[PDB]
């Protein structure tokens, strides 16, 4: 049997297969294609290849089968085939015209709640990447002692490694031992691997490196006040992945949807007979789609493009280390 727990398992397999897809940062050409006139034709032709439509098949099939049974029973009562003790399963649409606004508002507000979490995650990552950039810039400008060349090089290696370590902590199946192969030294990477909380371990490396630096006390206090950003980022990411939206607030939306779609063929039979099947199909493909988008967007980190966000910090620190000698030579030639 196709409906006997086969469609829902295939839907889940495909949905989890689509979660681990490579994302890239938008540049200007992608934005041109996004704003283009062909966008509507594109989105149409891209369905049956998207997570949201492929994960929507079970509900829509279930609610179309119910409408076919309602229709085939009301059609059996008329032009009667069965004993006259069975009534027509029909009703008035007036009760559901006074409640449609409530269901519409509840679905749209739940989707907005989910988008809020998406935005929170994006901002948290924005502040982490900005802070890693600013800390690395300050370390390059501040650390000047010839005797602390070795520790500075290590100190800039642990900053670039922090966004990667945090990205491996919030993404289900990633290998931190492969992403940090070329960043950390062989002996420092084993200390990170033995730790249960890898980003916490890299923070401890950075904090201990800043103590052994022969800086003035004022400058050391200034430098070590930038670590608080990494703590805040770790916190926000852990809470966004640990603490979902209220389950009451979500089961409400689910229960209301199922009840509305079960009795919708009964209120619509009186005016459109046998047209309730496509009406139920369209209602189930629209209202359930709105809920599904919100469910997918809610743990936000699988759809954020963190690899290019980490690569940006890596590239920026490499560029800043390469451009040091030219800038120092240009600023040395001021009045001489």
């Amino acid at each position: 049997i196709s409906i006997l727990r086969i469609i829902p398992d295939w839907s889940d397999r495909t949905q989890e297969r689509g979660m681990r897809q490579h994302r890239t940062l938008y540049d200007h050409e992608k934005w041109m294609h996004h704003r283009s006139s062909y966008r509507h034709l594109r989105h149409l032709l891209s369905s049956l290849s998207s997570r949201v439509i492929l994960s929507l098949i079970p509900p829509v099939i279930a609610f179309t089968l119910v409408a076919v049974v309602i229709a085939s029973y009301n059609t059996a009562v008329a032009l009667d085939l069965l004993p006259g003790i069975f009534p027509l399963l029909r009703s008035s649409s007036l009760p559901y015209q006074l409640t449609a606004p409530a269901l519409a508002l509840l679905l749209v507000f739940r989707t907005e709640a989910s988008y809020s979490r998406f935005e929170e995650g994006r901002k948290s990552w924005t502040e982490v990447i900005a802070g890693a950039n600013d800390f690395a810039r300050q370390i390059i400008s501040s650390v000047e002692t010839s005797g602390d060349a070795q520790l500075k090089k290590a100190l800039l290696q642990y900053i670039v490694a922090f966004p990667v370590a945090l990205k491996c902590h919030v993404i289900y199946g990633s290998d931190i031992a492969r992403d940090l192969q070329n960043l950390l030294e062989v002996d420092d990477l084993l200390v990170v691997l033995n730790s249960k909380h890898r980003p916490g371990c890299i923070i401890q490396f950075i904090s201990r490196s800043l103590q052994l630096l022969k800086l003035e006390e004022s400058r050391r206090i200034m430098l070590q006040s930038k670590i608080s950003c990494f703590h805040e980022g770790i916190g926000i990411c852990e809470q966004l992945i640990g603490t979902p939206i209220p389950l009451s607030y979500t089961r409400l939306t689910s229960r209301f949807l199922v009840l509305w779609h079960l009795t919708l063929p009964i209120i619509l039979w009186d005016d459109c007979h046998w047209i309730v099947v496509p009406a139920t199909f369209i209602s189930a493909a629209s209202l359930f789609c709105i809920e599904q988008v919100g469910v997918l967007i809610e743990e936000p980190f699988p759809m954020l493009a963190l690899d290019d966000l980490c690569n940006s910090v890596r590239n920026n620190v490499q560029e800043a280390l390469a451009s040091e000698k030219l800038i120092r030579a240009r600023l040395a030639a001021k009045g001489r």
Copy 2:
């Protein structure tokens, strides 16, 4: 009599029994189950085991009984059994089709107001746990004097004890003497027990420990500027548990709901006769459910999973104290 103050007392007993339920942080597998295709069937089969549906029985029963009396009186006036001086209790639906949007918007906005408080509580806890982590990291990195080993150990014990003490202050029936058994020393725990404001007492311990530390004045000022986070967290939690949403804003929603559900059988009699009973049942189970979710989510701390949030800080400080010697040995071998 089942309706004579029996259902509302059983509903309250069950509702308060469900408030004190153990919550856990979501990991990745829980998120897989949450996003799955079987979610709708699950939420259906989980009803009659949830707070929101079990606390919804009194209103829905009350408003279905009213509809049965309206119906059984209108049915008595037709095919008359009674003197002809009694009129039919019927009306037009047109007045309620111009006001449905207002009730829908008012209910959904009240629920969003409640979710705002839920989010405020979650963020407050996020900042408290992040700050406890950051303070503990800085104390481990900064305190280096051999003569202050004893006070440092105590200083890290009062940081881990702060989130627990704050969690026992915002949760109705918890024993702080059992949660802090293995964290604080026997003599320091009695000073916390005799205090009316336990988190305030632990803050006073931390502040006094930071004065007796033989630190430089700049470093002491840097360290003691991290205590402000704990004050802010205490404040926000106390205000969220002390100051609810305006009672005007809540009694409005309640009064409007009761009035709409009392007269709903009268406006719906003219088109659906005797179908007003199930219509009233569905309207009362949907509109009252939306309000109930909002009432439950509004004091937010019973549904936040604070035990795993405190355990995280405990584990992190233990891991950081265990990994100190390896990190110091690795950073010592830079140029030697």
Copy 3:
């Protein structure tokens, strides 16, 4: 005449009498009663004792009298009593079915605007009370010189007096000379009384006390950076009480309501005859109630429970001063 400026004056007298009502912080038992099943019956039986319903009588009576005149004129044109030159005052409901959403959205958005101001006031007070707590804690921990015992005692007296002084500034009829009797000394209270801006005067006392303290310059700069919170709190409270929501944004809502309720009997006459009186009554009691809640919640400080918020700071500083000797004795016994 009852309607000749008698009902509106009694309504105003009662409304202003209900503004000055004692509020208490919610504890856990109050929250139990709030979430209970009996809440709906309670809110019903509590009407005719609430500000919002007693201040709603004039509009609802005015709009019910209009409907009675419309009805008694349409009933006079039919079964004619009058010359045939007078037409029936009836219309179509179709124009008002395309505009109902706009009025619903405008009323609900105005109420949300008002709740935003309520939340702003609550947060402002949260930050003021948290800052007073944190400043007092730091003064207790930092000030250690035996020669500055007298000034420290005064310095902690002006912190506790600040929330009270600010509460008397934002509450219409309060006596600051009675609330500060037991807090300030007899000579310092006369300097506060002669000032036009009392919270500003207490801030000047705190700032001058921090200069005469024989502290190190770093520690004095740290201590006097906490006064900025009190300035910010004063600012926000003054702006919330001085600058209301745009009068355009409010007169719009009022004008739209009055116009909709004047012509509502004319559009509803064609389907429900003489049932327009109760329909007008219900519409005026619902739509006007939504607006009234928003008007009451808008200057937010009369409904915030500031006395218990100030008493909290008083109690906390007393408890911290009493627990000093035990904490110092416990921390002295670390390695000796």
Copy 4:
């Protein structure tokens, strides 16, 4: 001709005449009058004296004339006066019953967008006035040297002058040479007058005054960190007056309104004949009014009462300078 560019010019003249109206801060009595029962009668009787209703005449007259032409043509086709080749200009209301929600939501959301800008401006001013108060308080408490009496007096004169200078920069026709007559000295005011950016010039005065003050370096750094508030305030005000809401987002609302009101008589003719004129009148007076309120509130500074906000800072600094000797004498008598 009254309609030939006469009504729109008179409307603009009156609208710009009403922009430059004196505003005062609300005290408690004004709040009593605002919350009163007579408010609805007041707002009614105040129309034909308000900006929003007087600037609404052109659109409402234009759309009522269109409805009169539609009606007088449909009435000419019936009881025919003209050749039978002209059809009746009638339609079905069903298309506009599925789109009314969209127009309602778009208008209300645009008005909320405008109120957001109003709130941004109010908060920006709140932070500027609070910061000017806090800077002035700190300068009074900190500057103690007898040799810097002359510069301190000037330093407090430039703080009070800053809110006035910023208010003259964001208000169209104000004279800064008259508002600063009694605040600045005759020679310092000419340097401000010759500058293109007056608030920027006063900031440069304050910054240069803080360098010539014989303060300790820590205290000078603390004092000059308060200037950043004035920069932030200048920025926010300039951006709010320079960068309006997207013109796409505004022309959409305008175009949709004009199209809906042009064809509204055609869809409403089929049920109400000749009643489309008042229906069009009411729709144009309600929907256009909602848009107009939003247009007026959008550059927010003409309706904020900045003169009383500046006068507050002036009064507070005068009061603090007058109360210095009493506070110093009271604090001197602590143990002596």
Copy 5:
């Protein structure tokens, strides 16, 4: 063929041609014209010259052609021209009257999501320009050594160059080598040109200039704490241009729109015959317009007027450098 990929390519060419349009800051006269009575006539006459209407032709033409085919087939089935096996393609409007609210809310919420990004971009730029102003003011006031005249002049040149460099990074086709011709020296501009991340390079110049300045350590730490604003601004701009709104959240809106507009002639045929063509035209020109505005506003930087925002900082630093001697001479004459 006009419809064979000709209209969509011309629409895209025109749309991208309109993206690169010069924007200016609003002054007071522009605000007068914006609030004027003639605004509605203006917006009407300005269509067929706007991006949003010219990019709306393909969808509206496509959905009007569908309605013409539906109409010309239903008209062929009636007054039959074809074999009687073909049914009438008609339906009931009742299913779409219960779903209209959902589509309205989804479109308006997506447009609000886009406006949120517009506001984020505006605020980010506000903070960058304010910070550049404040840093430049502090450098002018602080740097006093005669031997560091040459480096100060350069230091003020790199601050003014930062907003320009950031503007060339977020705007598709701009020449940074032409915008910085008169700002930077010939040798310093080549170091900026060779860099992949130009704003990052200018930040490295500023940081290295602040190290070679013979300042006190406290003052150097104060000055170099202002660079963090430029990092935060770079971050926010890069994330706003790299990370768009969820594609699920956007393809949902597109798919729902296309499905609603394809079947709209079928539900509207039963009451308005052949009037479905203009109804489809109006629905497609309104609902698609709302979506298009949101798509255009979403990457926010092409419609922000950044050239006048950079020119403001340039002018302000020139004015502050010119007014230094007058202010110093005025403040020198205090007691002498």
